[PDB]
Amino acid sequence: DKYETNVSYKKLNQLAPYFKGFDGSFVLYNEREQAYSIYNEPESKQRYSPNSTYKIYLALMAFDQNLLSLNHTEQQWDKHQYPFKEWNQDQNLNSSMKYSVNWYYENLNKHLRQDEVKSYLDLIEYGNEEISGNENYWNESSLKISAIEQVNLLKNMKQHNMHFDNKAIEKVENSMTLKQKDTYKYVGKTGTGIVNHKEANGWFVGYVETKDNTYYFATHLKGEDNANGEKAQQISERILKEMELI
Ligand SMILES: *C(=O)N1C[C@H](NOS(=O)(=O)O)CC[C@H]1C(N)=O
Numbered sequence: 001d002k003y004e005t006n007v008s009y010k011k012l013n014q015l016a017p018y019f020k021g022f023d024g025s026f027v028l029y030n031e032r033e034q035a036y037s038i039y040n041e042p043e044s045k046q047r048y049s050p051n052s053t054y055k056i057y058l059a060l061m062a063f064d065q066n067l068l069s070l071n072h073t074e075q076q077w078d079k080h081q082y083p084f085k086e087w088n089q090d091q092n093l094n095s096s097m098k099y100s101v102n103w104y105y106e107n108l109n110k111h112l113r114q115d116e117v118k119s120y121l122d123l124i125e126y127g128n129e130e131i132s133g134n135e136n137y138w139n140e141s142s143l144k145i146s147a148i149e150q151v152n153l154l155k156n157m158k159q160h161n162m163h164f165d166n167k168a169i170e171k172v173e174n175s176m177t178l179k180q181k182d183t184y185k186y187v188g189k190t191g192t193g194i195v196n197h198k199e200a201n202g203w204f205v206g207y208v209e210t211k212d213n214t215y216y217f218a219t220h221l222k223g224e225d226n227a228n229g230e231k232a233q234q235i236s237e238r239i240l241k242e243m244e245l246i
Helices: 013-019 041-045 051-064 093-098 102-110 114-124 147-158 166-175 229-242
Strands: 009-011 023-030 035-039 177-180 184-195 198-210 214-222
Touching: 013 023, 013 035, 013 229, 023 041, 023 147, 023 229, 035 041, 035 147, 041 147, 041 214, 051 093, 051 102, 051 114, 051 147, 051 166, 051 184, 051 198, 093 166, 147 166, 147 198, 147 214, 166 177, 184 229, 198 229, 214 229
Parallel strands: 009 035
Antiparallel strands: 023 035, 023 214, 177 184, 184 198, 198 214
């Protein structure tokens, strides 16, 4: 249920107003200073379903297993009518990440042996590593990860500490790039979990890369409703702008 760590951190308790209406957390890791800053340390260690934020690592596993190639990420739509018309069309990695196209990533998972998935989640230390709850174990099911762990995995990915190809990481980074200026690249991914027909679990995770540093972040929202990726991203952008990072 909870990630155990004793790392020191700077308290960010005056970020509380941004989380009106939610039990929330914000985690920041400053790469140059090797330093964490956290709002709501108890929630930062609580593990929650990753929902669409898991697509990052399904993409990487798929490259590593050669289901996807640096120049070959297209998948054909099978004509199932989804309620989101963005999903009702052929996709590549960039479009599937942008439009958070579940079937693209479900197909990837279907062609990964679940024993291989367990091995990957062990190696990258993906939260509770529990994938037995449902075929789509990352969607409001058994697999859960905390906000600090989301930051840790992004930093391990970008710092080339995972056993994934650097060019595959670049492709996944590109697929989640939200803004690129001369002074910074802003990368991130939303997620939303539905419980009792309400938005009860919102994520936004990513990083800002500047010309001299990288700032990794994760925002989590818990609530009875309205806790979704869009709101988690809005709060994140308010915080990051106050930090003068974007
Ligand atoms: C990912 O969490 N999902 C797929 C899609 N988009 O969500 S996102 O924009 O927050 O990434 C719909 C919601 C959600 C899901 N439960 O499948």
